[PDB]
Each structure stands twice: as C-alpha cells, then as structure tokens.
Amino acid sequence: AVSVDCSEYPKCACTMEYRPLCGSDNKTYGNKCNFCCAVVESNGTLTLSHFGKC
C-alpha cells in the first residue's frame, strides 16, 4: 500500500508519535519507528498492512 525508505534505520527507542499501524507482522505498530526497527530484526521480511488496528 505504501513504500517506506529505512536503509539501515534501526531505532527501537522511539516513544512519542503514537500510530497504530496494521503491520504485515500480524499486529499493530506503535509508529513508523517501530516499523523500521522490527524490519531490521525481521531481515526485511516484515511490512505494513493498513494504518489502523488490524
């Protein structure tokens, strides 16, 4: 649905912008900072699904 550019953007210490995204990981996300962080540990096998509680 949307393309994100995080060429090496591991940041699992964000805590401010609240945004419940439906990530392809089968769950919601706390923000795009947690989306690019889970992707750094997913090996690029994680994505988005539809902004909003899955």
Side-chain angles (χ1 to χ4, degrees):
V2 181
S3 205
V4 57
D5 297 61
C6 269
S7 42
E8 219 243 21
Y9 202 79
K11 317 285 164 107
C12 264
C14 297
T15 290
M16 183 133 53
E17 188 107 290
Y18 208 100
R19 229 122 303 239
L21 325 170
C22 182
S24 251
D25 74 295
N26 217 155
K27 263 259 145 243
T28 303
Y29 268 121
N31 43 64
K32 62 99 103 215
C33 181
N34 230 232
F35 183 105
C36 286
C37 193
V39 165
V40 156
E41 72 120 24
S42 268
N43 206 157
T45 69
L46 207 52
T47 89
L48 190 58
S49 334
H50 78 87
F51 260 54
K53 189 104 124 209
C54 290

